Design an enzyme around this catalytic site. Sequence first.
Site, PDB file in Angstrom:
ATOM      1  N   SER A  55     -25.010  26.534 -19.607  1.00 47.79           N
ATOM      2  CA  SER A  55     -26.189  26.269 -18.756  1.00 47.79           C
ATOM      3  C   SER A  55     -25.995  25.022 -17.898  1.00 47.79           C
ATOM      4  O   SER A  55     -25.516  23.977 -18.394  1.00 47.79           O
ATOM      5  CB  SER A  55     -27.432  26.085 -19.593  1.00 47.79           C
ATOM      6  OG  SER A  55     -28.530  25.872 -18.726  1.00 47.79           O
ATOM      7  N   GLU A 114       0.872  -1.186   0.000  1.00 43.61           N
ATOM      8  CA  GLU A 114       0.000   0.000   0.000  1.00 43.61           C
ATOM      9  C   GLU A 114       0.899   1.222   0.000  1.00 43.61           C
ATOM     10  O   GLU A 114       0.589   2.240  -0.644  1.00 43.61           O
ATOM     11  CB  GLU A 114      -0.958  -0.006   1.203  1.00 43.61           C
ATOM     12  CG  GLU A 114      -1.934   1.156   1.160  1.00 43.61           C
ATOM     13  CD  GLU A 114      -1.436   2.455   1.785  1.00 43.61           C
ATOM     14  OE1 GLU A 114      -0.301   2.529   2.332  1.00 43.61           O
ATOM     15  OE2 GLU A 114      -2.214   3.447   1.693  1.00 43.61           O
ATOM     16  N   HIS A 156     -15.268   7.391 -11.783  1.00 40.99           N
ATOM     17  CA  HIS A 156     -16.540   7.757 -11.079  1.00 40.99           C
ATOM     18  C   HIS A 156     -16.805   9.242 -11.465  1.00 40.99           C
ATOM     19  O   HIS A 156     -15.907  10.062 -11.386  1.00 40.99           O
ATOM     20  CB  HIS A 156     -16.331   7.686  -9.561  1.00 40.99           C
ATOM     21  CG  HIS A 156     -17.601   7.523  -8.786  1.00 40.99           C
ATOM     22  ND1 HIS A 156     -18.534   8.538  -8.644  1.00 40.99           N
ATOM     23  CD2 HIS A 156     -18.057   6.480  -8.049  1.00 40.99           C
ATOM     24  CE1 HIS A 156     -19.528   8.115  -7.871  1.00 40.99           C
ATOM     25  NE2 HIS A 156     -19.271   6.860  -7.506  1.00 40.99           N
ATOM     26  N   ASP A 158     -30.072  -6.015  -6.391  1.00 47.80           N
ATOM     27  CA  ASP A 158     -29.166  -5.742  -7.559  1.00 47.80           C
ATOM     28  C   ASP A 158     -29.271  -4.278  -7.943  1.00 47.80           C
ATOM     29  O   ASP A 158     -28.246  -3.634  -8.268  1.00 47.80           O
ATOM     30  CB  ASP A 158     -29.469  -6.627  -8.767  1.00 47.80           C
ATOM     31  CG  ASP A 158     -28.956  -8.052  -8.620  1.00 47.80           C
ATOM     32  OD1 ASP A 158     -28.290  -8.348  -7.584  1.00 47.80           O
ATOM     33  OD2 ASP A 158     -29.227  -8.855  -9.543  1.00 47.80           O
TER      34      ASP A 158
HETATM   35  O1  LIG Z   1      -0.069   6.905   4.131  1.00 45.07           O
HETATM   36  C1  LIG Z   1      -1.105   6.608   3.514  1.00 45.07           C
HETATM   37  N1  LIG Z   1      -2.310   6.834   4.012  1.00 45.07           N
HETATM   38  C2  LIG Z   1      -2.568   7.398   5.355  1.00 45.07           C
HETATM   39  C3  LIG Z   1      -2.534   8.958   5.191  1.00 45.07           C
HETATM   40  C4  LIG Z   1      -2.538   9.767   6.504  1.00 45.07           C
HETATM   41  C5  LIG Z   1      -2.475  11.319   6.211  1.00 45.07           C
HETATM   42  C6  LIG Z   1      -3.629  11.989   5.438  1.00 45.07           C
HETATM   43  N2  LIG Z   1      -4.971  11.550   5.932  1.00 45.07           N
HETATM   44  C7  LIG Z   1      -6.011  11.277   5.121  1.00 45.07           C
HETATM   45  O2  LIG Z   1      -5.845  11.257   3.899  1.00 45.07           O
HETATM   46  C8  LIG Z   1      -7.355  10.662   5.751  1.00 45.07           C
HETATM   47  C9  LIG Z   1      -7.365   9.963   6.968  1.00 45.07           C
HETATM   48  C10 LIG Z   1      -8.553   9.361   7.522  1.00 45.07           C
HETATM   49  C11 LIG Z   1      -9.866   9.354   6.959  1.00 45.07           C
HETATM   50  I1  LIG Z   1     -11.704   8.339   7.878  1.00 45.07           I
HETATM   51  C12 LIG Z   1      -9.795  10.082   5.726  1.00 45.07           C
HETATM   52  C13 LIG Z   1      -8.636  10.694   5.126  1.00 45.07           C
HETATM   53  C14 LIG Z   1      -3.964   6.944   5.803  1.00 45.07           C
HETATM   54  O3  LIG Z   1      -4.887   6.847   4.938  1.00 45.07           O
HETATM   55  O4  LIG Z   1      -4.065   6.668   7.022  1.00 45.07           O
HETATM   56  N3  LIG Z   1      -0.989   6.112   2.279  1.00 45.07           N
HETATM   57  C15 LIG Z   1       0.370   6.148   1.672  1.00 45.07           C
HETATM   58  C16 LIG Z   1       0.426   5.618   0.194  1.00 45.07           C
HETATM   59  C17 LIG Z   1       0.063   6.637  -0.817  1.00 45.07           C
HETATM   60  C18 LIG Z   1      -1.198   6.224  -1.505  1.00 45.07           C
HETATM   61  O5  LIG Z   1      -1.181   7.437  -0.640  1.00 45.07           O
HETATM   62  C19 LIG Z   1       0.828   7.647   1.706  1.00 45.07           C
HETATM   63  O6  LIG Z   1      -0.054   8.537   1.730  1.00 45.07           O
HETATM   64  O7  LIG Z   1       2.070   7.912   1.673  1.00 45.07           O
HETATM   65 ZN   LIG Z   2      -1.373   2.884   5.828  1.00 45.40          ZN
HETATM   66 ZN   LIG Z   3       1.092   4.972   5.304  1.00 42.64          ZN
END
Ligand SMILES: O=C(N[C@@H](CCCCNC(=O)c1ccc(I)cc1)C(=O)O)N[C@@H](C[C@H]1CO1)C(=O)O
Ligand SMILES: [Zn+2]
Ligand SMILES: [Zn+2]
Lengths: 694, 694
Positions: B574, B370, B633, B610
């Site tokens: 529009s 990830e 999306h 469905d």
């Molecule tokens: O670290 C990752 N994700 C953390 C990011 C934490 C910082 C920013 N927070 C959000 O984006 C966030 C957290 C919780 C919720 I409920 C919604 C959004 C997470 O999702 O917990 N993913 C990695 C991998 C690359 C794909 O993003 C990164 O960002 O470096």
């Molecule tokens: Zn993570």
């Molecule tokens: Zn992470």
Amino acid sequence: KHNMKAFLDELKAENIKKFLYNFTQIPHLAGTEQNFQLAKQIQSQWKEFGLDSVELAHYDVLLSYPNKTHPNYISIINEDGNEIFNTSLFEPPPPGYENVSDIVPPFSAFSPQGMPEGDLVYVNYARTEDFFKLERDMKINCSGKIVIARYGKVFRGNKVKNAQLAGAKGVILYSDPADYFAPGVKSYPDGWNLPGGGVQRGNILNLNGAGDPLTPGYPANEYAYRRGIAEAVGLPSIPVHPIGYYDAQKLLEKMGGSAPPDSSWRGSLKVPYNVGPGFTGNFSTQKVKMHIHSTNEVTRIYNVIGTLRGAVEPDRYVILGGHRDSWVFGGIDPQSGAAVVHEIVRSFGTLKKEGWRPRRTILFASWDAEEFGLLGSTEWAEENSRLLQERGVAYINADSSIEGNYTLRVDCTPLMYSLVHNLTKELKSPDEGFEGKSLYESWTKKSPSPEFSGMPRISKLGSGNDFEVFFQRLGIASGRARYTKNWETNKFSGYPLYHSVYETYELVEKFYDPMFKYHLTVAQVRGGMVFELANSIVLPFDCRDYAVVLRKYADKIYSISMKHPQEMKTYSVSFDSLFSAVKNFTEIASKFSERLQDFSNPIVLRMMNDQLMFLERAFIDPLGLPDRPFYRHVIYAPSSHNKYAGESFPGIYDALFDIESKVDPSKAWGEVKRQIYVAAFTVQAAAETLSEVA
Amino acid sequence: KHNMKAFLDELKAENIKKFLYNFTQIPHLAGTEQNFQLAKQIQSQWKEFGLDSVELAHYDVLLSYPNKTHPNYISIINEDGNEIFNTSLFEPPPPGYENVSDIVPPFSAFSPQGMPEGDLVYVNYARTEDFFKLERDMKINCSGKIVIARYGKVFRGNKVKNAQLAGAKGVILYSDPADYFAPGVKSYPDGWNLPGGGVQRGNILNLNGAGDPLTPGYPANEYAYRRGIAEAVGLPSIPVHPIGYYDAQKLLEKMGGSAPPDSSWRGSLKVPYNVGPGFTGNFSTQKVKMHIHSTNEVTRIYNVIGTLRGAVEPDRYVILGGHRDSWVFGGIDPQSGAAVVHEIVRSFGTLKKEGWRPRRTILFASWDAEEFGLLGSTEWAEENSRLLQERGVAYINADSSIEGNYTLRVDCTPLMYSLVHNLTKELKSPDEGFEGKSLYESWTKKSPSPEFSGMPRISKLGSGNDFEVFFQRLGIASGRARYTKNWETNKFSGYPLYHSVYETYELVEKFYDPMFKYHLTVAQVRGGMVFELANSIVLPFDCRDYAVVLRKYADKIYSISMKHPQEMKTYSVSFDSLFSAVKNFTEIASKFSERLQDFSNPIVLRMMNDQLMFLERAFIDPLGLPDRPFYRHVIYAPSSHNKYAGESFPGIYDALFDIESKVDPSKAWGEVKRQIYVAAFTVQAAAETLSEVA
Ligand SMILES: O=C(N[C@@H](CCCCNC(=O)c1ccc(I)cc1)C(=O)O)N[C@@H](C[C@H]1CO1)C(=O)O
Ligand SMILES: [Zn+2]
Ligand SMILES: [Zn+2]
Ligand SMILES: *[C@@H]1O[C@H](CO)[C@@H](O[C@@H]2O[C@H](CO)[C@@H](O[C@@H]3O[C@H](CO)[C@@H](O)[C@H](O[C@H]4O[C@H](CO)[C@@H](O)[C@H](O)[C@@H]4O)[C@@H]3O)[C@H](O)[C@H]2NC(C)=O)[C@H](O)[C@H]1NC(C)=O
Ligand SMILES: *[C@@H]1O[C@H](CO)[C@@H](O[C@@H]2O[C@H](CO)[C@@H](O[C@@H]3O[C@H](CO)[C@@H](O)[C@H](O[C@H]4O[C@H](CO)[C@@H](O)[C@H](O)[C@@H]4O)[C@@H]3O)[C@H](O)[C@H]2NC(C)=O)[C@H](O)[C@H]1NC(C)=O
Ligand SMILES: O=C(N[C@@H](CCCCNC(=O)c1ccc(I)cc1)C(=O)O)N[C@@H](C[C@H]1CO1)C(=O)O
Ligand SMILES: *[C@@H]1O[C@H](CO)[C@@H](O[C@@H]2O[C@H](CO)[C@@H](O)[C@H](O)[C@H]2NC(C)=O)[C@H](O)[C@H]1NC(C)=O
Ligand SMILES: *[C@@H]1O[C@H](CO)[C@@H](O[C@@H]2O[C@H](CO)[C@@H](O)[C@H](O)[C@H]2NC(C)=O)[C@H](O)[C@H]1NC(C)=O
Ligand SMILES: *[C@@H]1O[C@H](CO)[C@@H](O[C@@H]2O[C@H](CO)[C@@H](O)[C@H](O)[C@H]2NC(C)=O)[C@H](O)[C@H]1NC(C)=O
Ligand SMILES: *[C@@H]1O[C@H](CO)[C@@H](O[C@@H]2O[C@H](CO)[C@@H](O)[C@H](O)[C@H]2NC(C)=O)[C@H](O)[C@H]1NC(C)=O
Ligand SMILES: *[C@@H]1O[C@H](CO)[C@@H](O[C@@H]2O[C@H](CO)[C@@H](O)[C@H](O)[C@H]2NC(C)=O)[C@H](O)[C@H]1NC(C)=O
Ligand SMILES: *[C@@H]1O[C@H](CO)[C@@H](O[C@@H]2O[C@H](CO)[C@@H](O)[C@H](O)[C@H]2NC(C)=O)[C@H](O)[C@H]1NC(C)=O
Ligand SMILES: *[C@@H]1O[C@H](CO)[C@@H](O)[C@H](O)[C@H]1NC(C)=O
Ligand SMILES: *[C@@H]1O[C@H](CO)[C@@H](O)[C@H](O)[C@H]1NC(C)=O
Ligand SMILES: *[C@@H]1O[C@H](CO)[C@@H](O)[C@H](O)[C@H]1NC(C)=O
Ligand SMILES: *[C@@H]1O[C@H](CO)[C@@H](O)[C@H](O)[C@H]1NC(C)=O
Ligand SMILES: *[C@@H]1O[C@H](CO)[C@@H](O)[C@H](O)[C@H]1NC(C)=O
Ligand SMILES: *[C@@H]1O[C@H](CO)[C@@H](O)[C@H](O)[C@H]1NC(C)=O
Ligand SMILES: [Ca+2]
Ligand SMILES: [Ca+2]
Ligand SMILES: [Cl-]
Ligand SMILES: [Cl-]
Ligand SMILES: [Zn+2]
Ligand SMILES: [Zn+2]
């Protein structure tokens, strides 16, 4: 009982004859008032016949028409600029119709305007191999020339694309008697051959499945945002016009330059078939000049959509569709098919009035603007794509019911092979000498499978008709069936009066099917397929038949690649993954068939009917084929050289085609390996949809 | 009884604590042996817990690692080329782990190699608006400069993309105490703040949903044909490296050129925050030099996939997934989430051993890689896309369960809003002062909806985690929930020790959640959602909630366009079609809800289940968004300026963004109208999937 025999017995030859007469008295050109009136009539009659709902679905699409006050024609001019010969401005109308109004004169729909003047080059059928022969072998350069090509063998849009890429500044298409005049039969009105003044109309688009040129991807509804013409999909860049063989003889007889390279380049006219360029010594200073003034115009079209709601699975759709628009009277194309559809609706409606409903929903469609590029069916499918891809069981097409009187012709997905074989074994042959024998027996005798012995030929689906969006874009199991001729080399050329003013009710009633028995047989095949698809408890698809063909297609594409053994060694080109996937598909399909035979549980049933329904869907790649985003099926596509023909493993086929001529062989073979990977992955993924679900 | 209460009561804080400890003793970096060993352990334990099948799905994908014998660092050099200051080669390891092997040093994954030397420019958070301010207002040119940017506010990959497009030749990312040091709390190990030597790891890709950079569209299986690196998706073109604030202070303190333009550009360090370019007078001849030697390498990764087969609808899948790979010990990210998933599997397995099965199939996933761009989840979804799009009911993500201890945070599709509200009303609040109150009550009090009063905030989904392929590409209803902080301006920045060596088991056990009660609450929310999705007779989605938000998003995008009234008049822009579609969706959704409430018939039920399952699917456009083919999306996409944030009506939003700066306004506004048409059509098409089917 309300069973298939009840449905089939209600169909009557006499009703089909009455409907054909009713549909062919006036022209029904797409976008005209007459065709809208017919749409309204059909809508009204389908309601009277008993359908639950019948609506018109309209779209505003790009059509093309000649200019009524500025006619299209071709000349030979002299060096002073006097036009010393002109082609005809219209086909002599048939007897009793010399006073019909609004017969559109022969033209090539979507031709741009222009008045190009130049020297002629004759390019045989203007196929990819004919241009290879001219340019590579004969060293004749078509750049800045007007090309003259005979109709036949391949879709005319492919001819025009080929001529454009060769650098032609215009194209003249003509019908040679070699291809459109059967020996020993008389010209219309005394027989079914093309007269010298007859001309084949038809569009020259290369849409590759896009539908309306201005709105690829989305329905051309009231708020649609349209591409400008310069960005439209598939429009030709050089003027194009069709002529008859009296006129063609005048243009060809003066041709000089090189002799034809061999006899396969000579038609039946009393001319040398010199390839040119230009005319022999005495006439060396005369030129050919085209005058094309047709206009492209956004115009409203109307589909009629009838619904017969299913009793048990109303959210599963079996679609019977065929078009209604015609070039002129549409005696064969399409009204011989539309009259069959009309009698099928009547028969289903007769059962409905007695309290019966099919298991699944049946949708009936009368499409508009098929002749201008499948526009009606494609726009409606774009509008309804979400419903179709999650609910569409099958599509059966119903254009021309007859193009001859010899035997059946069928093209369909392998998933319907068993269904077609089983149904035709239960239908009576209409053929002379096969009284009391099955249609399967006559068809198999007259059209033997090239592989299988004791089985009939069924061909692959490409394009050329309204099933294209449902099968090639959306991955809905599709099929088509008609009565045909015994004229194998002419199987893509059309019957002699194809798209001419001479295709009339009288043509059919006098020369093709006086007792409407071939029409009735075709109604039984098409309507019988729809009945079984809409009523069988288990969907009538056999996944093992796909496994058999996938092996054949894998063997075929491997054999093409193996013409290049040194490159396969150098670039490590292996088909092992594709054969592995086919082997897996075969094994998994066998196991699924066992479960299907051996499984009271309506969840398991429908779970397994969903596995059957989504199997064709699994062959769709959402990224499409290379530079053809609307052809998404990985096993089949319309051939890149002839849209009428289906090609198997088209992504690999096209990567291999003429590969020995590519300047960067590493890159070219890399792209072959990429297509093998996409094909092996898609086969395996499709196989996995048939595994136990959890 | 085997009901949701039984499931929920079986979950234990003590088990989550034990699992977290077990998962965080050694690093589990993607592609390493340690992470493969953990995969094998989880697979074995999930089998012991009672799942029907548990398999590893492996792929060979592009990863990135520093060179062990050639470390990455940054220098200040003098005019003689002596490096007079160097950044750290590693983070000081936390107490008791100063002898752990294989802690990867801080680096920016996928940075190219290079040794660029130049003058610094400080670009605040390197957001689109920060670069607009520099270039347009301050007239500072970043071309050929090294940019230094603080982490925070937006995804770091967006910073790098922005710096590239500004012409930077390298990027230095650092953690400013303004964003990563909460006032009044101590640095790790004595509190939860970032120390001056701490550094945030993380990838800097701009994949836009593609997954493995070498195989967009297809799984990176054994026979995959890979793009060459030069054609790979989303790789940065300039070197990038992250540093801590002790090091940043050394680079920033000598900065000259312009003052920061305002206080929003100043962090908390004792430096001026001059934007540059370059250093003040005395040091004007010193430069900054980067040394980056990381390598990109195709490396095997492993997902663990567990199946609990449904009793009634085994061909409908509810997926609970979260990743297992970590940058170092993964104390919060991801093992706080993986420990929750583990206890959820255990609980479901405990019911299974007593004879219970869920109605629908539940799939459990431990994703790999990830942290390197969602590679494990995306490759598996590419492999299984056909099964997922025809059978996928919902995906619930499970990365970090806690990023604070204040209240719940939820992002999900509108289809799950009712489900989340209803479940949280039945769960106990874990919060101090809300003893005996529902989680809904505490969450609503602490995180009020900006629109709705008496309701909690739920945000839009973008990217940044493993739900992206399921929601943005495939259109499967998705949701996520965690416990969070009260620090609104920091909601995209991460908690202070995010992606640092300091995120350990001790961090969580000492400072975040000593009694594992917030973990348990999150397990109840995530596991409760999965339970209801997999067990409710009627799927727990409310289409009327989508109708409400579509109106809000339509109002919002119209309001953005209306900042340009003269252009809307000139180009006849529009929004009427989009409002019409939203109105139709509202009306049809109301009628569908009535039928759903008012319909013993399992066909009607499943037909209507469905319709519910395919409603999210209907918002997918198979042609994708402009130049982002894997974001399909039409209602939501990750923001083009910040992949962590969701954007609504992204095609129209992006067409309008900075439109006043486009050189050809006719073309720019044409593209706005095109996106309005695509959005209105897609809303109407989605609405029509809820109409009576026939
Ligand atoms: O670290 C990752 N994700 C953390 C990011 C934490 C910082 C920013 N927070 C959000 O984006 C966030 C957290 C919780 C919720 I409920 C919604 C959004 C997470 O999702 O917990 N993913 C990695 C991998 C690359 C794909 O993003 C990164 O960002 O470096
Ligand atoms: Zn993570
Ligand atoms: Zn992470
Ligand atoms: C048809 O179905 C069969 C299943 O009946 C399916 O077989 C699968 O084949 C793949 C690819 O050959 C196997 O992949 C192997 O998996 C093992 C672990 O199980 C790995 O260790 C292997 O990798 C090693 O060996 C490779 C080849 O020499 C090296 O390149 C690599 O670096 C490793 O050293 C390899 O990935 C998979 O195990 C089977 N699955 C089975 C037998 O269940 C086959 O793929 C299907 N065909 C298609 C086209 O999908
Ligand atoms: C929301 O749902 C409503 C249905 O409740 C749906 O209404 C449809 O609107 C379209 C577009 O406005 C209507 O289209 C009209 O159809 C008639 C024939 O029925 C035509 O004659 C009309 O064309 C004439 O008028 C046009 C506009 O002035 C001219 O441009 C044109 O050249 C013609 O002169 C027009 O095509 C359609 O009838 C209704 N359907 C109904 C009421 O059932 C609406 O489209 C939905 N919203 C969206 C965004 O899909
Ligand atoms: O005329 C059309 N279709 C005829 C084509 C007749 C000549 C070539 N025949 C086949 O392609 C064919 C016929 C029957 C069967 I079963 C399978 C293939 C038809 O399908 O009956 N379509 C139009 C419209 C453009 C989209 O092709 C045309 O080709 O000009
Ligand atoms: C084709 O058949 C239709 C249906 O019978 C004919 O249309 C009907 O004509 C009668 C007499 O003019 C009218 O009373 C009806 O209202 C029409 N019914 C419709 C349109 O549903 C039509 O006349 C026939 N066409 C030809 C050329 O014979
Ligand atoms: C072919 O048709 C053209 C166009 O109608 C004829 O040429 C025209 O002749 C008329 C009357 O003599 C002149 O006024 C026009 O100026 C001519 N137009 C052009 C474009 O040349 C031509 O005579 C016809 N040729 C034959 C053999 O019938
Ligand atoms: C075509 O007919 C054949 C012969 O009846 C059908 O095959 C039989 O199907 C039944 C029901 O599953 C089996 O019990 C028999 O063993 C089958 N006979 C065979 C395979 O030789 C076949 O299903 C029909 N195809 C359809 C309906 O698509
Ligand atoms: C995490 O827990 C697992 C499972 O209990 C431990 O792995 C087991 O260790 C014992 C003793 O070495 C072995 O007998 C088992 O075969 C292992 N079971 C597995 C892998 O399923 C592992 O030791 C724990 N890890 C840590 C760091 O405590
Ligand atoms: C920063 O690190 C660099 C690289 O290790 C140091 O420069 C090196 O110093 C050694 C020993 O004196 C020389 O043999 C190398 O040739 C130098 N390499 C380079 C690339 O300059 C430098 O001394 C360090 N600076 C500080 C302040 O510690
Ligand atoms: C959330 O709970 C509410 C309140 O129970 C549910 O709404 C009720 O659902 C039942 C069954 O359809 C109706 O008979 C009631 O009239 C509803 N009450 C309302 C709308 O106020 C709602 O269905 C639940 N949401 C889910 C399960 O997604
Ligand atoms: C058709 O040609 C006439 C004159 O020959 C002209 O006045 C008119 O513009 C043309 N119609 C078109 C281009 O639709
Ligand atoms: C064909 O003729 C054109 C026009 O002069 C020229 O540009 C082109 O190179 C020629 N090609 C060949 C293969 O002779
Ligand atoms: C109908 O069949 C007969 C007998 O073989 C044949 O002579 C006749 O030409 C056929 N008609 C057509 C249009 O093929
Ligand atoms: C890492 O760097 C060393 C020397 O510092 C070198 O020998 C080796 O090639 C590099 N490893 C890579 C590029 O994977
Ligand atoms: C920025 O500097 C580069 C390098 O000299 C130059 O090419 C570019 O035009 C400059 N742009 C602006 C806006 O000053
Ligand atoms: C846990 O909550 C308390 C009480 O509000 C707070 O002081 C402490 O900082 C919190 N821990 C974290 C990591 O936020
Ligand atoms: Ca369209
Ligand atoms: Ca991939
Ligand atoms: Cl047909
Ligand atoms: Cl999460
Ligand atoms: Zn036709
Ligand atoms: Zn036709």
